[PDB]
Structure 1
Amino acid sequence: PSALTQPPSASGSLGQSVTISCTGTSSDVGGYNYVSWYQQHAGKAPKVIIYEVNKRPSGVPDRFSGSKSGNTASLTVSGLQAEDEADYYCSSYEGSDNFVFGTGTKVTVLGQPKANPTVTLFPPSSEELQANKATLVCLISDFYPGAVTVAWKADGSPVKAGVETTKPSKQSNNKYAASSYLSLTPEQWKSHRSYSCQVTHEGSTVEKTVAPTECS
């Protein structure tokens, strides 16, 4: 048997463009015209962007393009914008009711501005307290690239315990977002002068502090 052959790397820079290969055989891509191009975000829906070798779906943007050339179908995504980072799989009709897929391509943009994160600290809410538990959410958002560390602090002295810190998702703007949490008893909470959230990105350190004051 066999798959379909794409190469796993189509890198380009913004404004520019990229040109992905999907090679089949005269049994799938060669003979039938039904070659489709999926766009897929990390472990999210994929969707049809190209379907009958090349044609526009309506709500698919104006510049992903498909080509056929023998055993080979090609997507050329012209003009490159950030978000085009994805995984693009092809599909080729075989016969006797069966569709076969590709190795897929991870697409990468370059020249995307780097961002130092917005760091929002959240003190333990009123009800959290009424229930008698306390949690601190450091919301580390809007960064790029996706390397960022987190540290919490007792009071100057550190907190290397209690903390769970999710590691970085990607959002609607092709910028990354992560969070960190200190789970503590309100004892602990009302005991200390302040609890910090230190967040470290491409050399730019940020520290946000929280003191029992709140409004919550």
Structure 2
Amino acid sequence: SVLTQPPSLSASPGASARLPCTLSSDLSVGSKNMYWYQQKPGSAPRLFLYYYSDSDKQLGPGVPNRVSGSKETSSNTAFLLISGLQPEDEADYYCQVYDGSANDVFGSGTKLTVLGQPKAAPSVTLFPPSSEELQANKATLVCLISDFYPGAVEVAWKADGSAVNAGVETTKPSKQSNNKYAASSYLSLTSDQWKSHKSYSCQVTHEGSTVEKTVAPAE
């Protein structure tokens, strides 16, 4: 038995997101108890909606009144309906039923995007290697990038104006609690490599705009 959810869904603020959960044909959505869980980064899922019918339904603890459910028997699909959309609605939504022995069955989740979030340039902090790390003959430059939206970012390191390709590891952007994005980039170097240049630069490009921070081994 299988629940099919689209991987992602976008919707406008004020309007309604209709998240579908399609049940395999061996089930009849008409008579199935549906459960929806909301999950945000870093936390366990939380019960969002229990839906059998418009007559028999309950919102989960702390869930606002603008949430509802429905079922389309023709497409054998249950829906989670979120009205009056706000940014705090952005999350992963999992649908779930149970089989005859109360075994859980989960859909794969829909990541819901609320449109119209204002563009936000990244804040960038570059740290040089510490003196403790230089004693260990190593040097890590730490470029920390936060509060940007949308969550796409390009990172380039420069040494004395020349591109640096080796030793660079950058994280995927990850959604922060305020619905902006965070990422970080590490330039890993030997102490001697770090001493052999007058400056290093972390350049962060975001929707065509580049924010740049620089650090100098002179100290």
Q: TM-score, normalised by structure 2?
A: 0.82
**Structure-to-structure mapping, 1:13-162, within 5 angstroms:** 13-24=12-23, 27=27, 29-32=29-32, 34-41=33-40, 45-53=44-52, 54-68=57-71, 72-102=77-107, 104-162=109-167
Q: Which consecutive residues of structure 1, in runs of 5 or more, have no partner in the other structure?
A: none
> For residues 30-62 of structure 1, what are the alpha-carbon distances to aligned partners after superposition, in whole Å with 9 as ceiling and x for unaligned?
335x31002234696322211354312223344
Structure 2 CA distance for partners of 1:166 and 1:22, relative to 1, 3 Å: closer
Query: Residue 38 of structure 2 aligns to a residue in which SS?
Result: strand
Query: Which whole-Å CA distance do the structure 2 matches of 1:199 and 1:145 have between them?
Result: 13
Query: Which whole-Å CA distance do the structure 1 matches of 2:63 and 2:127 have between them?
Result: 39
1:199 to 196, 199, 204: 204
Bigger Cα displacement from structure 2, 49-58 vs 197-206: 49-58
Query: Which whole-Å CA distance do the structure 1 matches of 2:134 and 2:117 have between them?
Result: 42
Match for residue 189 of structure 1? Answer: 194
Structure 2 CA distance for partners of 1:28 and 1:43, relative to 1, 3 Å: farther
CA drift of 1:28 comes to 5.7
Q: Is the 8 A contact 1:27 1:94 kept in 2?
A: no
Query: Residue 30 of structure 1 aligns to a residue in which SS?
Result: helix
Query: Which whole-Å CA distance do the structure 1 matches of 2:192 and 2:6 have between them?
Result: 56
Q: Is the 8 A contact 1:138 1:197 kept in 2?
A: yes
> For residues 115-158 of structure 1, what are the alpha-carbon distances to aligned partners after superposition, in whole Å with 9 as ceiling and x for unaligned?
11111100111221233311101112121112211111211222
Q: Is the 8 A contact 1:28 1:92 kept in 2?
A: no
Structure 2 CA distance for partners of 1:207 and 1:103, relative to 1, 3 Å: closer
Match for residue 175 of structure 1? Answer: 180
Match for residue 217 of structure 2? Answer: 212
CA drift of 1:187 comes to 2.2
Q: Is the 8 A contact 2:47 2:61 kept in 1?
A: no
Query: How large is the Cα RMSD of the aligned pairs?
Result: 2.6
AA in 2 matched with 1:183? S
**Alignment size in residue pairs:** 212
Q: Is the 8 A contact 2:51 2:70 kept in 1?
A: no
Query: Which whole-Å CA distance do the structure 1 matches of 2:132 and 2:90 have between them?
Result: 41
Q: Is the 8 A contact 2:48 2:61 kept in 1?
A: no
Query: Residue 132 of structure 2 aligns to a residue in which SS?
Result: helix
Structure 2 CA distance for partners of 1:121 and 1:104, relative to 1, 3 Å: closer
Q: Is the 8 A contact 2:147 2:182 kept in 1?
A: yes
AA in 1 matched with 2:162? S
Query: Which whole-Å CA distance do the structure 2 matches of 1:167 and 1:5 have between them?
Result: 26
Structure 2 CA distance for partners of 1:5 and 1:185, relative to 1, 3 Å: closer
AA in 2 matched with 1:31? S
Q: Which consecutive residues of structure 2, in runs of 5 or more, have no partner in the other structure?
A: none
